Amino acid sequence: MKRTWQPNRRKRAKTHGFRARMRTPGGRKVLKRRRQKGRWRLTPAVRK
Amino acid sequence: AVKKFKPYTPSRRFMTVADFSEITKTEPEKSLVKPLKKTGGRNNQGRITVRFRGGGHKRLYRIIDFKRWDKVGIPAKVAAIEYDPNRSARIALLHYVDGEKRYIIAPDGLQVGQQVVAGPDAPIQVGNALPLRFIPVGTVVHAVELEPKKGAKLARAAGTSAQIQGREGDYVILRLPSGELRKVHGECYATVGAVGNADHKNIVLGKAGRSRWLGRRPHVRGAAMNPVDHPHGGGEGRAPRGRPPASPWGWQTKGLKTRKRRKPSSRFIIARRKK
RNA sequence: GAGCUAGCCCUGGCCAGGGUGAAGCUGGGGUGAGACCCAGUGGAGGCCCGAACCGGUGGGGGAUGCAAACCCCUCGGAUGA
RNA sequence: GAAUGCCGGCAUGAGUAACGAUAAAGAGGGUGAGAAUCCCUCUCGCCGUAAGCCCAAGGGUUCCUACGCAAUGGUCGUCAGCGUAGGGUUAGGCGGGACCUAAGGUGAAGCCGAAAGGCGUAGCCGAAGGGCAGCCGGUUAAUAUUCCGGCCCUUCCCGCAGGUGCGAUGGGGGGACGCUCUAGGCUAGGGGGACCGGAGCCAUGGACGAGCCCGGCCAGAAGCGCAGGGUGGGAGGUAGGCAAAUCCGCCUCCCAACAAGCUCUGCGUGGUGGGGAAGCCCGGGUGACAACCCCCCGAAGCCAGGGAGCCAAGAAAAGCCUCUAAGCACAACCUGCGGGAACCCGUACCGCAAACCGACACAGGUGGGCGGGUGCAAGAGCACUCAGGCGCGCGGGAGAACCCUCGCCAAGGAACUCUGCAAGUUGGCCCCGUAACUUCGGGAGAAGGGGUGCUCCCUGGGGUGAUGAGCCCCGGGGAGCCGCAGUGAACAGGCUCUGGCGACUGUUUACCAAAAACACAGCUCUCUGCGAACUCGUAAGAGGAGGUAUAGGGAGCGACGCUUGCCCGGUGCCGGAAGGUCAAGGGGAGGGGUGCAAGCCCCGAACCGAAGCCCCGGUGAACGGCGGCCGUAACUAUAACGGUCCUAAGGUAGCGAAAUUCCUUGUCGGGUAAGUUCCGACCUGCACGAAAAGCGUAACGACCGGAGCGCUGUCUCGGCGAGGGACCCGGUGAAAUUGAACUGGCCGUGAAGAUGCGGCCUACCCGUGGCAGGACGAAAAGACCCCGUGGAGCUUUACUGCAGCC
RNA sequence: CGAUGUCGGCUCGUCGCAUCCUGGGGCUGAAGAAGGUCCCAAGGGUUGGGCUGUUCGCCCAUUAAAGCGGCACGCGAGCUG
RNA sequence: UGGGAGAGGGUGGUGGAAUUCCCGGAGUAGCGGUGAAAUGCGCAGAUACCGGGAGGAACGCCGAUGGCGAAGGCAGCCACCUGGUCCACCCGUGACGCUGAGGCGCGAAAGCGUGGGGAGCAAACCGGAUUAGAUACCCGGGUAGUCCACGCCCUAAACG
RNA sequence: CCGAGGGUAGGGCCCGUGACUGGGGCGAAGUCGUAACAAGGUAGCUGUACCGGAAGGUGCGGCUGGAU
RNA sequence: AAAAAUGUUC
Ligand SMILES: [Mg+2]
Ligand SMILES: [Mg+2]
Ligand SMILES: [Mg+2]
Ligand SMILES: [Mg+2]
Ligand SMILES: [Mg+2]
Ligand SMILES: [Mg+2]
Ligand SMILES: [Mg+2]
Ligand SMILES: [Mg+2]
Ligand SMILES: [Mg+2]
Ligand SMILES: [Mg+2]
Ligand SMILES: [Mg+2]
Ligand SMILES: [Mg+2]
Ligand SMILES: [Mg+2]
Ligand SMILES: [Mg+2]
Ligand SMILES: [Mg+2]
Ligand SMILES: [Mg+2]
Ligand SMILES: [Mg+2]
Ligand SMILES: [Mg+2]
Ligand SMILES: [Mg+2]
Ligand SMILES: [Mg+2]
Ligand SMILES: [Mg+2]
Ligand SMILES: [Mg+2]
Ligand SMILES: [Mg+2]
Ligand SMILES: [Mg+2]
Ligand SMILES: [Mg+2]
Ligand SMILES: [Mg+2]
Ligand SMILES: [Mg+2]
Ligand SMILES: [Mg+2]
Ligand SMILES: [Mg+2]
Ligand SMILES: [Mg+2]
Ligand SMILES: [Mg+2]
Ligand SMILES: [Mg+2]
Ligand SMILES: [Mg+2]
Ligand SMILES: [Mg+2]
Ligand SMILES: [Mg+2]
Ligand SMILES: [Mg+2]
Ligand SMILES: [Mg+2]
Ligand SMILES: [Mg+2]
Ligand SMILES: [Mg+2]
Ligand SMILES: [Mg+2]
Ligand SMILES: [Mg+2]
Ligand SMILES: [Mg+2]
Ligand SMILES: [Mg+2]
Ligand SMILES: [Mg+2]
Ligand SMILES: [Mg+2]
Ligand SMILES: [Mg+2]
Ligand SMILES: [Mg+2]
Ligand SMILES: [Mg+2]
Ligand SMILES: [Mg+2]
Ligand SMILES: [Mg+2]
Ligand SMILES: [Mg+2]
Ligand SMILES: [Mg+2]
Ligand SMILES: [Mg+2]
Ligand SMILES: [Mg+2]
Ligand SMILES: [Mg+2]
Ligand SMILES: [Mg+2]
Ligand SMILES: [Mg+2]
Ligand SMILES: [Mg+2]
Ligand SMILES: [Mg+2]
Ligand SMILES: [Mg+2]
Ligand SMILES: [Mg+2]
Ligand SMILES: [Mg+2]
Ligand SMILES: [Mg+2]
Ligand SMILES: [Mg+2]
Ligand SMILES: [Mg+2]
Ligand SMILES: [Mg+2]
Ligand SMILES: [Mg+2]
Ligand SMILES: [Mg+2]
Ligand SMILES: [Mg+2]
Ligand SMILES: [Mg+2]
Ligand SMILES: [Mg+2]
Ligand SMILES: [Mg+2]
Ligand SMILES: [Mg+2]
Ligand SMILES: [Mg+2]
Ligand SMILES: [Mg+2]
Ligand SMILES: [Mg+2]
Ligand SMILES: [Mg+2]
Ligand SMILES: [Mg+2]
Ligand SMILES: [Mg+2]
Ligand SMILES: [Mg+2]
Ligand SMILES: [Mg+2]
Ligand SMILES: [Mg+2]
Ligand SMILES: [Mg+2]
Ligand SMILES: [Mg+2]
Ligand SMILES: [Mg+2]
Ligand SMILES: [Mg+2]
Ligand SMILES: [Mg+2]
Ligand SMILES: [Mg+2]
Ligand SMILES: [Mg+2]
Ligand SMILES: [Mg+2]
Ligand SMILES: [Mg+2]
Ligand SMILES: [Mg+2]
Ligand SMILES: [Mg+2]
Ligand SMILES: [Mg+2]
Ligand SMILES: [Mg+2]
Ligand SMILES: [Mg+2]
Ligand SMILES: [Mg+2]
Ligand SMILES: [Mg+2]
Ligand SMILES: [Mg+2]
Ligand SMILES: [Mg+2]
Ligand SMILES: [Mg+2]
Ligand SMILES: [Mg+2]
Ligand SMILES: [Mg+2]
Ligand SMILES: [Mg+2]
Ligand SMILES: [Mg+2]
Ligand SMILES: [Mg+2]
Ligand SMILES: [Mg+2]
Ligand SMILES: [Mg+2]
Ligand SMILES: [Mg+2]
Ligand SMILES: [Mg+2]
Ligand SMILES: [Mg+2]
Ligand SMILES: [Mg+2]
Ligand SMILES: [Mg+2]
Ligand SMILES: [Mg+2]
Ligand SMILES: [Mg+2]
Ligand SMILES: [Mg+2]
Ligand SMILES: [Mg+2]
Ligand SMILES: [Mg+2]
Ligand SMILES: [Mg+2]
Ligand SMILES: [Mg+2]
Ligand SMILES: [Mg+2]
Ligand SMILES: [Mg+2]
Ligand SMILES: [Mg+2]
Ligand SMILES: [Mg+2]
Ligand SMILES: [Mg+2]
Ligand SMILES: [Mg+2]
Ligand SMILES: [Mg+2]
Ligand SMILES: [Mg+2]
Ligand SMILES: [Mg+2]
Ligand SMILES: [Mg+2]
Ligand SMILES: [Mg+2]
Ligand SMILES: [Mg+2]
Ligand SMILES: [Mg+2]
Ligand SMILES: [Mg+2]
Ligand SMILES: [Mg+2]
Ligand SMILES: [Mg+2]
Ligand SMILES: [Mg+2]
Ligand SMILES: [Mg+2]
Ligand SMILES: [Mg+2]
Ligand SMILES: [Mg+2]
Ligand SMILES: [Mg+2]
Ligand SMILES: [Mg+2]
Ligand SMILES: [Mg+2]
Ligand SMILES: [Mg+2]
Ligand SMILES: [Mg+2]
Ligand SMILES: [Mg+2]
Ligand SMILES: [Mg+2]
Ligand SMILES: [Mg+2]
Ligand SMILES: [Mg+2]
Ligand SMILES: [Mg+2]
Ligand SMILES: [Mg+2]
Ligand SMILES: [Mg+2]
Ligand SMILES: [Mg+2]
Ligand SMILES: [Mg+2]
Ligand SMILES: [Mg+2]
Ligand SMILES: [Mg+2]
Ligand SMILES: [Mg+2]
Ligand SMILES: [Mg+2]
Ligand SMILES: [Mg+2]
Ligand SMILES: [Mg+2]
Ligand SMILES: [Mg+2]
Ligand SMILES: [Mg+2]
Ligand SMILES: [Mg+2]
Ligand SMILES: [Mg+2]
Ligand SMILES: [Mg+2]
Ligand SMILES: [Mg+2]
Ligand SMILES: [Mg+2]
Ligand SMILES: [Mg+2]
Ligand SMILES: [Mg+2]
Ligand SMILES: [Mg+2]
Ligand SMILES: [Mg+2]
Ligand SMILES: [Mg+2]
Ligand SMILES: [Mg+2]
Ligand SMILES: [Mg+2]
Ligand SMILES: [Mg+2]
Ligand SMILES: [Mg+2]
Ligand SMILES: [Mg+2]
Ligand SMILES: [Mg+2]
Ligand SMILES: [Mg+2]
Ligand SMILES: [Mg+2]
Ligand SMILES: [Mg+2]
Ligand SMILES: [Mg+2]
Ligand SMILES: [Mg+2]
Ligand SMILES: [Mg+2]
Ligand SMILES: [Mg+2]
Ligand SMILES: [Mg+2]
Ligand SMILES: [Mg+2]
Ligand SMILES: [Mg+2]
Ligand SMILES: [Mg+2]
Ligand SMILES: [Mg+2]
Ligand SMILES: [Mg+2]
Ligand SMILES: [Mg+2]
Ligand SMILES: [Mg+2]
Ligand SMILES: [Mg+2]
Ligand SMILES: [Mg+2]
Ligand SMILES: [Mg+2]
Ligand SMILES: [Mg+2]
Ligand SMILES: [Mg+2]
Ligand SMILES: [Mg+2]
Ligand SMILES: [Mg+2]
Ligand SMILES: [Mg+2]
Ligand SMILES: [Mg+2]
Ligand SMILES: [Mg+2]
Ligand SMILES: [Mg+2]
Ligand SMILES: [Mg+2]
Ligand SMILES: [Mg+2]
Ligand SMILES: [Mg+2]
Ligand SMILES: [Mg+2]
Ligand SMILES: [Mg+2]
Ligand SMILES: [Mg+2]
Ligand SMILES: [Mg+2]
Ligand SMILES: [Mg+2]
Ligand SMILES: [Mg+2]
Ligand SMILES: [Mg+2]
Ligand SMILES: [Mg+2]
Ligand SMILES: [Mg+2]
Ligand SMILES: [Mg+2]
Ligand SMILES: [Mg+2]
Ligand SMILES: [Mg+2]
Ligand SMILES: [Mg+2]
Ligand SMILES: [Mg+2]
Ligand SMILES: [Mg+2]
Ligand SMILES: [Mg+2]
Ligand SMILES: [Mg+2]
Ligand SMILES: [Mg+2]
Ligand SMILES: [Mg+2]
Ligand SMILES: [Mg+2]
Ligand SMILES: [Mg+2]
Ligand SMILES: [Mg+2]
Ligand SMILES: [Mg+2]
Ligand SMILES: [Mg+2]
Ligand SMILES: [Mg+2]
Ligand SMILES: [Mg+2]
Ligand SMILES: [Mg+2]
Ligand SMILES: [Mg+2]
Ligand SMILES: [Mg+2]
Ligand SMILES: [Mg+2]
Ligand SMILES: [Mg+2]
Ligand SMILES: [Mg+2]
Ligand SMILES: [Mg+2]
Ligand SMILES: [Mg+2]
Ligand SMILES: [Mg+2]
Ligand SMILES: [Mg+2]
Ligand SMILES: [Mg+2]
Ligand SMILES: [Mg+2]
Ligand SMILES: [Mg+2]
Ligand SMILES: [Mg+2]
Ligand SMILES: [Mg+2]
Ligand SMILES: [Mg+2]
Ligand SMILES: [Mg+2]
Ligand SMILES: [Mg+2]
Ligand SMILES: [Mg+2]
Ligand SMILES: [Mg+2]
Ligand SMILES: [Mg+2]
Ligand SMILES: [Mg+2]
Ligand SMILES: [Mg+2]
Ligand SMILES: [Mg+2]
Ligand SMILES: [Mg+2]
Ligand SMILES: [Mg+2]
Ligand SMILES: [Mg+2]
């Protein structure tokens, strides 16, 4: 049947994207924490 | 003169429609229609704050004139009488000799092509707008302002009308549609006559789908919910109220008055509503 | 976290074919005038049958599955909430 | 050495199940170390409203080639969506951006919030909506409305000419709209041609034929023609469109009024450029100087912003036109012509899927367009088939049980069973025909029945065309032929009677419940006078509603018909300027501490002093409640009648062994051979009862009952047959489970059910296909129960707080 | 209680004997026939249907007879549900 | 043709008296009610009196034994629309007349539908008395209804 | 071809009967009350409406076939 | 302007 992951690039960038993160205090902490961990990708990669 | 249907479906035997006999024009005036931003009953937070709202037919809001004192003395012709999806009453289209075109809600009797005017010196005539003080006692009025120059707020629904029962200072005594007796300021404008389309209350919606056309979504009884949902929730099988019948939020809904006791307009209400 | 799911908002799209034949209109009859009667035209409806489509009734299979809800037969809605 | 321990490694089950749709294969030739599996050819089968094609999303080089086969591929592999390497995506016109707005988002102003932040008019952003310039063919191994050829067009810039009060983010017009139905004319698409072109073919009995087979176009600027859309002209006045206005709006007057005119699209034609099959020869070439013609069918598409009807009354903004404002009228704008200029991104390939979402090359999920032919009443249905694409990435055998899916069946015909579950039956169309009841629509496809192919003959009307031929579309009558059977295949209701429940179409527990549950129109009560009540928020601000009592909220009831009784003592709510209680506060008699004292400080009575509660009334479609015992009638029996006790009042109409009845399978009646069910009654109703509505109700129901007909493998009662498995062989090769095992029966014993102890009995060693009684078999640290001073959801006149409100 | 699946049916039986029938007897208030009752006997047999989920029971039609129990109220790694 | 009388009918309007509720004043211990009472109302200020207001319904005197209509029935007043009707003159038509199964229409009250409205009155219902009881009469309340619109109903001691 | 009739299916009228149920009639001396006849002890009757063990009662309007 | 019911049989 219809499953949960229905990929959509625009959705992905407006929900989890760098700019969405920076706009809210929680998103900023998210980026902050992923940087402190040393992630290679603070945000999901999507092609646009 | 509500229009009955033959019972050629289950729902058509009760369904009555408006007769639309007074309408002379079936398309709104372009210069007067804005988009009606449908809400679905949801506030700027996104939340449903009035329940069971939405999904009704698309509408265009027609700009109505509740300030007929805007154009004192300038007479106008009744160009047309038109449908309005945003109210129970019919709206009249006015061609002011100014060349200005405005909509007003159509009082009963108002005939397409008659002249109406607004101001202290206006004839006491159907569809004229005078300040409350210049209208004779005993006159049936509608579209009544409640505070001077603030807009017609009373008796705008189909068939409604207030009656001028007497005067007392800068205020006239009005019997609102509710049967309340109120002091409204004499400088407040009203329009002589009752609102048209009295038959509006005799329309039998007919079927559930019709209600959905009006934007009215299904209403769920408290009795059918669970205790998480409603004071009437739960029970094994059917169950009576089991407490003072209450709203979803706890307050009692049978007789419990809720007008603010200390409201400053109390000084202006002579007698709470009838019946 | 509403890319699943629930509701609403905006803007688009879809609904084979067939059946029934409301009002109205016209003509005739009717009468003081009427109601109304009839015929034709008309093409209404959470109308009828039935694909797409949306469903998920009964049964069978499946049960370390093709599938963490599937398959077959059957069955409901299909201009509408 | 144990923790259902942790990690890893390796066992067991086991050469076991499986190898993923039962659409399907066979042979020859090639390649190569090796071939069922790669390439080629022939044959065969499967999709064909797709299993074909083209878009969008998503994916991201998977595209094309060359060389490869360790791993990936459920087998094999020489092949590949795999490994390596090289190559490939070309735009002013397609899509998006340099255009516009929608929800929404954001947000100079402004508002609010301990902080973080929340809002918010304009504005800005925001698309699959508006707007806007490219069509046909050729080319590559791989891209093409992108390169090339032909023929067209857009904007920007500059110039030339002509014309004009030019000039805007401002005014206005327009853009600009629903649903259903639909006219005319076209086109797309299709069918036929005895006409045109074509390599040919004559077979196996016939046919050299008006035979067969194949094809018979595509794009196109101006002009033109056909069809449509849009649109009055002028004058005078003007106070309105937040400045102005010659525009638009309003009034008058003259003319025009199905028109015409002006304009814009569609289609046809059109200089011109293309294309062009079968077959044959090796993607190509020939065919071919290919022909390119007539008739019909005909869109849902086009003219379009068409027409009508309806009620639920159907975006915005830019582009564009117009008006004037600053300004400027050497400008600027408009029109025509010319030259120049025209950017960034996408473009491969998959794309109903082996490349997307499902951990897999997963039988699942995935929006838009095209979707041919014939026949079947029609269609996107169904069968077959074109183009095109496939045979589903283990095979070969065998022909047991058993299972799946399927076919048939003597006699019976529901005897099966919880139940006709299931499976039969019925089945389209045309015609005849059709009941209770009913809300007059229906019930109704009721029920039931006849008809159905092919041939020949006569004839009726329709469309096209011309009024004719031809083609095409509805028919009508007569005579015949054949078969078991003519909707001869495929698709396509079994029906009736009668209760319960729910009016009805709808909705629901995604993944065990689709129902009688929720919803529903409709009814009542109730709150709400508008800065409404109510809801969300600390607030601002919203929703309510750009609504106004014919409206909005809440609550019960649930179409409709007929109805909806009595109890206001309690509880709720509503009313009640008295009375009683009542907090802070006021008041300050009177005490007290202290100090030489002035004084400073503490205590403090009456009395004044809200709501709330007390108290007085109202109120039931508010919460709710609607009796006991005893006696009595010319037989018994039973009580219309009385007596008495209690109550706030003692259950009314109607209904009643019920979705309710304990006793109970009540009693009587119907149906049956037989009826714990069913239906009709009775009424001592354990424990119906009137909007948690009472009693009915036509119609409706994948709801739940009872009965009959029809028909059946449901059954008596099983048999046979088909295929996919199971079985054998070659390939690949799991799983849970497992203290170790050299793992028998009885009768005992044993922690009370023993392969494992005793006694006896039986027993050569090891497998394979089978069955499940046992290993208290597996699985899940019982979901029941209890325990825990464990947890959570929910309730309230439990306790105690808090919001909110007074 | 780190799981021994619960009634009923179906299927498959197997055992007991306190015997329902069938075979053999004694006593009889056993004339015959037919009963009663007790004894021996478990070899074989012990029907189809209506009602109800039922076990059981009642009923219909038969029968030689329509036995009663045990087997985890036998039997869900056999089925039903 | 010219006149007349009349609650004939329909629509719209409008006038006063009275009852009720509300508001103001003034005012005190009762009021109300019956056969007599009680219920009820009243110091929370009733009744009685004055002023203002709201509302609905019915029209005193005239008024009659009267008038009109086919009947049911119709009563303040005004206007409009309209039917029937009598009288005079003896003008016109020239039997065109009478009755009337069906049909149609009208049809007091009560009732019913959908609305409105609602003062007074008042089935039902409550309470107080009476009574052996009192599901009645009498008393204090009181819902339909009585009123309006439209549409049904079509009854009667619809009687002379 | 028609055709007695037979059969299948569906209708209409009539008759008999049916648990139970509704009133009706009758039945020398049952039970409750006393509605009507006198002003029948509230004049009666009436159409209608609601209600009540029952006669009846009450409302609305009507009649006199009502006493004084 | 009526407090107050009833009555076996021929
Ligand atoms: Mg889903
Ligand atoms: Mg996932
Ligand atoms: Mg989606
Ligand atoms: Mg996207
Ligand atoms: Mg998105
Ligand atoms: Mg989304
Ligand atoms: Mg973002
Ligand atoms: Mg976001
Ligand atoms: Mg922060
Ligand atoms: Mg920061
Ligand atoms: Mg990572
Ligand atoms: Mg890095
Ligand atoms: Mg992140
Ligand atoms: Mg109707
Ligand atoms: Mg009708
Ligand atoms: Mg109207
Ligand atoms: Mg606009
Ligand atoms: Mg809004
Ligand atoms: Mg917002
Ligand atoms: Mg937000
Ligand atoms: Mg809300
Ligand atoms: Mg809502
Ligand atoms: Mg309107
Ligand atoms: Mg409204
Ligand atoms: Mg005011
Ligand atoms: Mg309504
Ligand atoms: Mg609406
Ligand atoms: Mg509801
Ligand atoms: Mg519930
Ligand atoms: Mg519930
Ligand atoms: Mg919740
Ligand atoms: Mg709670
Ligand atoms: Mg709660
Ligand atoms: Mg409850
Ligand atoms: Mg519950
Ligand atoms: Mg419940
Ligand atoms: Mg209950
Ligand atoms: Mg419930
Ligand atoms: Mg409550
Ligand atoms: Mg009020
Ligand atoms: Mg969503
Ligand atoms: Mg999505
Ligand atoms: Mg989404
Ligand atoms: Mg459809
Ligand atoms: Mg038909
Ligand atoms: Mg017709
Ligand atoms: Mg018409
Ligand atoms: Mg339908
Ligand atoms: Mg049909
Ligand atoms: Mg299923
Ligand atoms: Mg299985
Ligand atoms: Mg499963
Ligand atoms: Mg399936
Ligand atoms: Mg199927
Ligand atoms: Mg439907
Ligand atoms: Mg259907
Ligand atoms: Mg359809
Ligand atoms: Mg140890
Ligand atoms: Mg383990
Ligand atoms: Mg552990
Ligand atoms: Mg481990
Ligand atoms: Mg390791
Ligand atoms: Mg290993
Ligand atoms: Mg092994
Ligand atoms: Mg092994
Ligand atoms: Mg083997
Ligand atoms: Mg094995
Ligand atoms: Mg396996
Ligand atoms: Mg497998
Ligand atoms: Mg498989
Ligand atoms: Mg298949
Ligand atoms: Mg197939
Ligand atoms: Mg082969
Ligand atoms: Mg191979
Ligand atoms: Mg090989
Ligand atoms: Mg090949
Ligand atoms: Mg061959
Ligand atoms: Mg096809
Ligand atoms: Mg991928
Ligand atoms: Mg390999
Ligand atoms: Mg190899
Ligand atoms: Mg290698
Ligand atoms: Mg591999
Ligand atoms: Mg391999
Ligand atoms: Mg695989
Ligand atoms: Mg290999
Ligand atoms: Mg090789
Ligand atoms: Mg490429
Ligand atoms: Mg180009
Ligand atoms: Mg630029
Ligand atoms: Mg923008
Ligand atoms: Mg901020
Ligand atoms: Mg954005
Ligand atoms: Mg766009
Ligand atoms: Mg473009
Ligand atoms: Mg072009
Ligand atoms: Mg110009
Ligand atoms: Mg200009
Ligand atoms: Mg428009
Ligand atoms: Mg518009
Ligand atoms: Mg639009
Ligand atoms: Mg074309
Ligand atoms: Mg064709
Ligand atoms: Mg052309
Ligand atoms: Mg003009
Ligand atoms: Mg002007
Ligand atoms: Mg166009
Ligand atoms: Mg379409
Ligand atoms: Mg169009
Ligand atoms: Mg149009
Ligand atoms: Mg419509
Ligand atoms: Mg806008
Ligand atoms: Mg100059
Ligand atoms: Mg640029
Ligand atoms: Mg490309
Ligand atoms: Mg698919
Ligand atoms: Mg598709
Ligand atoms: Mg693929
Ligand atoms: Mg494909
Ligand atoms: Mg993949
Ligand atoms: Mg999966
Ligand atoms: Mg595969
Ligand atoms: Mg797949
Ligand atoms: Mg074709
Ligand atoms: Mg067909
Ligand atoms: Mg295959
Ligand atoms: Mg396939
Ligand atoms: Mg395969
Ligand atoms: Mg074999
Ligand atoms: Mg062999
Ligand atoms: Mg199959
Ligand atoms: Mg055969
Ligand atoms: Mg058979
Ligand atoms: Mg039979
Ligand atoms: Mg049968
Ligand atoms: Mg049966
Ligand atoms: Mg069942
Ligand atoms: Mg049954
Ligand atoms: Mg019938
Ligand atoms: Mg019947
Ligand atoms: Mg019936
Ligand atoms: Mg009917
Ligand atoms: Mg038919
Ligand atoms: Mg039939
Ligand atoms: Mg034939
Ligand atoms: Mg069929
Ligand atoms: Mg069917
Ligand atoms: Mg029943
Ligand atoms: Mg239901
Ligand atoms: Mg239902
Ligand atoms: Mg109902
Ligand atoms: Mg319903
Ligand atoms: Mg839903
Ligand atoms: Mg479920
Ligand atoms: Mg569930
Ligand atoms: Mg689940
Ligand atoms: Mg779930
Ligand atoms: Mg299920
Ligand atoms: Mg259902
Ligand atoms: Mg539900
Ligand atoms: Mg109702
Ligand atoms: Mg809140
Ligand atoms: Mg607001
Ligand atoms: Mg608003
Ligand atoms: Mg409901
Ligand atoms: Mg009470
Ligand atoms: Mg109370
Ligand atoms: Mg009380
Ligand atoms: Mg107080
Ligand atoms: Mg209650
Ligand atoms: Mg209670
Ligand atoms: Mg109580
Ligand atoms: Mg009653
Ligand atoms: Mg009973
Ligand atoms: Mg019974
Ligand atoms: Mg019942
Ligand atoms: Mg009960
Ligand atoms: Mg019982
Ligand atoms: Mg029982
Ligand atoms: Mg029985
Ligand atoms: Mg019964
Ligand atoms: Mg009894
Ligand atoms: Mg209740
Ligand atoms: Mg109940
Ligand atoms: Mg009825
Ligand atoms: Mg029914
Ligand atoms: Mg249903
Ligand atoms: Mg349904
Ligand atoms: Mg159902
Ligand atoms: Mg069988
Ligand atoms: Mg086989
Ligand atoms: Mg062998
Ligand atoms: Mg092997
Ligand atoms: Mg392998
Ligand atoms: Mg060992
Ligand atoms: Mg052994
Ligand atoms: Mg042993
Ligand atoms: Mg023991
Ligand atoms: Mg033992
Ligand atoms: Mg030992
Ligand atoms: Mg031993
Ligand atoms: Mg032994
Ligand atoms: Mg083996
Ligand atoms: Mg085996
Ligand atoms: Mg075993
Ligand atoms: Mg164990
Ligand atoms: Mg066991
Ligand atoms: Mg076992
Ligand atoms: Mg076991
Ligand atoms: Mg489990
Ligand atoms: Mg544990
Ligand atoms: Mg445990
Ligand atoms: Mg557990
Ligand atoms: Mg339990
Ligand atoms: Mg326990
Ligand atoms: Mg404790
Ligand atoms: Mg605890
Ligand atoms: Mg807790
Ligand atoms: Mg707090
Ligand atoms: Mg509150
Ligand atoms: Mg246990
Ligand atoms: Mg375990
Ligand atoms: Mg276990
Ligand atoms: Mg176990
Ligand atoms: Mg076990
Ligand atoms: Mg148990
Ligand atoms: Mg059986
Ligand atoms: Mg013997
Ligand atoms: Mg003897
Ligand atoms: Mg034996
Ligand atoms: Mg028993
Ligand atoms: Mg029993
Ligand atoms: Mg014998
Ligand atoms: Mg036994
Ligand atoms: Mg035992
Ligand atoms: Mg067992
Ligand atoms: Mg036991
Ligand atoms: Mg037991
Ligand atoms: Mg057992
Ligand atoms: Mg068992
Ligand atoms: Mg089982
Ligand atoms: Mg069992
Ligand atoms: Mg087991
Ligand atoms: Mg077993
Ligand atoms: Mg007093
Ligand atoms: Mg006092
Ligand atoms: Mg009033
Ligand atoms: Mg007279
Ligand atoms: Mg004469
Ligand atoms: Mg009448
Ligand atoms: Mg009346
Ligand atoms: Mg008289
Ligand atoms: Mg015959
Ligand atoms: Mg015969
Ligand atoms: Mg009497
Ligand atoms: Mg009397
Ligand atoms: Mg009474
Ligand atoms: Mg007296
Ligand atoms: Mg007596
Ligand atoms: Mg005597």
Residue numbers in the entry:
A (entry chain 17): 1 to 48
B (entry chain 1D): 2 to 276
Study authors write:
Tetracyclines inhibit protein synthesis by binding at the A site of the small ribosomal subunit and blocking the accommodation of an incoming aminoacyl-transfer RNA (aa-tRNA) into the A site of the bacterial 70S ribosome. More specifically, tetracyclines bind at the decoding center (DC) between the head and the shoulder of the 30S subunit, in a pocket formed by helices 31 (h31) and 34 (h34) of the 16S ribosomal RNA (rRNA). In this work, we determined two (2.8-Å and 3.0-Å) X-ray crystal structures of sarecycline bound to the initiation complex of the bacterial 70S ribosome and found that this antibiotic inhibits bacterial ribosome in part using a mechanism of direct mRNA contact, which has not been reported for any other tetracyclines so far. SAR is chemically distinguishable from other tetracycline antibiotics by the 7-[[methoxy(methyl)amino]methyl] group attached at the C7 position of the ring D.
To understand the functional relevance of the C7 moiety of SAR in the context of the translating ribosomal complex, we have determined the crystal structure of SAR bound to T. thermophilus 70S ribosome containing mRNA, and P-site–bound deacylated initiator tRNAiMet at 2.80-Å resolution. In this experiment, we used mRNA containing phenylalanine UUC codon positioned in the A site of the ribosome. At 2.80-Å resolution, SAR can be unambiguously fitted into the obtained electron density map, including its C7 group. Our structure reveals binding of SAR in the canonical tetracycline site that is located in the A site on the small ribosomal subunit. The polar edge of SAR directly contacts h31 and h34 of the 16S rRNA by forming hydrogen bonds (H-bonds) with the sugar-phosphate backbones of nucleotides C1195 and G1197. Similar to other tetracyclines, the polar edge of SAR also engages nucleotides G1053, G1197, and G1198 via a coordinated Mg2+ ion. Unlike TET, but similar to TIG, SAR also coordinates a second Mg2+ ion to enable an indirect interaction with the phosphate of the nucleotide m2G966 of h31. Interestingly, despite the expected absence of a tRNA in the A site in our structure, we do observe continuous electron density corresponding to the A-site codon of the mRNA, indicating that mRNA nucleotides must be stabilized by macromolecular interactions. Close examination of the SAR binding site revealed that the third nucleotide (cytidine) of the A-site UUC codon (position +6) is in close proximity to the C7 extension of SAR. However, it is also evident from our structure that the methoxy group of the C7 extension of SAR forms a van der Waals contact with the cytidine in position +6, which is a weaker type of interaction compared to an H bond but still can provide additional stabilization of the mRNA, explaining why we observe strong electron density corresponding to the nucleotides of the A-site codon.
